């Protein structure tokens, strides 16, 4: 009786339509997703602010889910250290069934309310951490038990689901409800619900990191340059922020240990490396504040 | 700073110059406004996506596999979409495969240099015995990731159909590939953060490539995925439910017909709706390529 499980009347003839019609239909349904997220903007906004607050108190952003949801959690978290320069501990994706569940099934993983207890305890989940439970259905027991444990510790709990008034929503402090409508292939939550979940998670990390100063203007100043594109982007970023040349950007970057934010601080302040480090620290890595003062 | 200024993926977004000073709600609203651009960008790609699906369907029918390659988020999304196919469609793990630069180490974190390593893609493709009957989909926002470029070249040299998905127009990847899909989502909210709009566009396109191709293989009755073989207890319950949902019959007929059809839900549905016996239903279904409603005339 859940929306996620309903049949979609616009896809009833999909088994006899042309290739173009099927993809047109899917693309049409896809336009529903950003609209569905729009209803959720106030809750998402509140989520970010609370996450930022938790980050400032030493807590982490923890994602849990099974199957596609858990994989999306891992995907979003994976990108935080190279984009924002933070540790792997800061945003962690946990998936039902562990490491292999990223590619492979794990029978009963989504129904194992005992395992989520172990999974959260082995990372010492605490009152200061934030738990986001992700399940299109809103009733995945693994996620439910996870949320319950987090709530019992006094931790902030966020639920992301695609059915209204879910059990997950009831438990969680903040209920994000992405009502994307019945899927094109009945029950295929990986489609619109997966897309919505990616959009929401992308917001939770991007927005919170922007607010923690993990960027400057719209430049990725905390990027970890682990390849040719990224190494060239760091140089580019320093030039964009300072109007200096390529030679000076590379030189400073080298001196700043490939830290573009530090390099920018050094160039726009004429300060030495150690003093630029000192001023940045004193303003929590917020380059704008470190230069404003 | 090399030629990155030329690529939309590396360009600055006018709407987010001050994003480090905008309020929390302004930030999420902007990300949301920009998200709206993505299905629109994919709309203009529908004819190429169609061509790609049709090619993939031929390959599936010729015993070929659908192979995804990429680095970083792209690679991960290839792996994501492929990982979902066996449970979603009741297919073998071999039929859709996701390969990511740097292997299993890259799945949770970056691997230093992996996207640059043009030798490694040769090993990765050879290790799964990539052949001319397979379809290679190269996935890269920038359209110039050398790992993926070399991937495609190797595939092309074999005579395998090649598909590229990129977010910059007229890319090197597009030049090499037979079918070029070009999702122009515009500059990201955080400059160069291709995990965002490009990642979303990538997921949407991959989802179409697998979902539409599976539908064309006849896996569906109306908008139900019915190709399930009840090899154990939990697939049986899923089969019974889908037989019931498709034919509006009761649990009794669904369970009995499942038995007579050797645990094949699709054939069970065929028997019930046609009133034909197992062997007869099998013949008629084959004559219409395993497409249920075409067979039921
Ligand atoms: C830009 C960034 O800081 N991180 C992301 C994307 O946001 C990149 O990945 C990182 C480096 C990784 O290896 O985890 C990106 O996914 C690859 O460079 C693929 O680029 P592309 O081939 O054009 O799709």
UniProtKB/Swiss-Prot annotation, chain B:
It holds the Pfam family GKRP_SIS_N. Its EC number is 4.2.1.126. Residues 56-219 form the SIS domain. It catalyses: N-acetyl-D-muramate 6-phosphate + H2O = N-acetyl-D-glucosamine 6-phosphate + (R)-lactate. GO terms for biological process: 1,6-anhydro-N-acetyl-beta-muramic acid catabolic process; amino sugar catabolic process; N-acetylmuramic acid catabolic process; peptidoglycan turnover. GO terms for molecular function: carbohydrate derivative binding; carbon-oxygen lyase activity; ether hydrolase activity. Pathway: Amino-sugar metabolism; 1,6-anhydro-N-acetylmuramate degradation; Amino-sugar metabolism; N-acetylmuramate degradation; Cell wall biogenesis; peptidoglycan recycling. It is an enzyme of class 4 (lyase). The active site is at 84 (proton donor), 115. Keywords: Carbohydrate metabolism, Lyase. Specifically catalyzes the cleavage of the D-lactyl ether substituent of MurNAc 6-phosphate, producing GlcNAc 6-phosphate and D-lactate. Together with AnmK, is also required for the utilization of anhydro-N-acetylmuramic acid (anhMurNAc) either imported from the medium or derived from its own cell wall murein, and thus plays a role in cell wall recycling. A lyase-type mechanism (elimination/hydration) is suggested for the cleavage of the lactyl ether bond of MurNAc 6-phosphate, with the formation of an alpha,beta-unsaturated aldehyde intermediate with (E)-stereochemistry, followed by the syn addition of water to give product. Homodimer. PANTHER family: GLUCOKINASE REGULATORY PROTEIN. Belongs to the GCKR-like family. MurNAc-6-P etherase subfamily. This is N-acetylmuramic acid 6-phosphate etherase. It comes from Haemophilus influenzae (strain ATCC 51907 / DSM 11121 / KW20 / Rd).
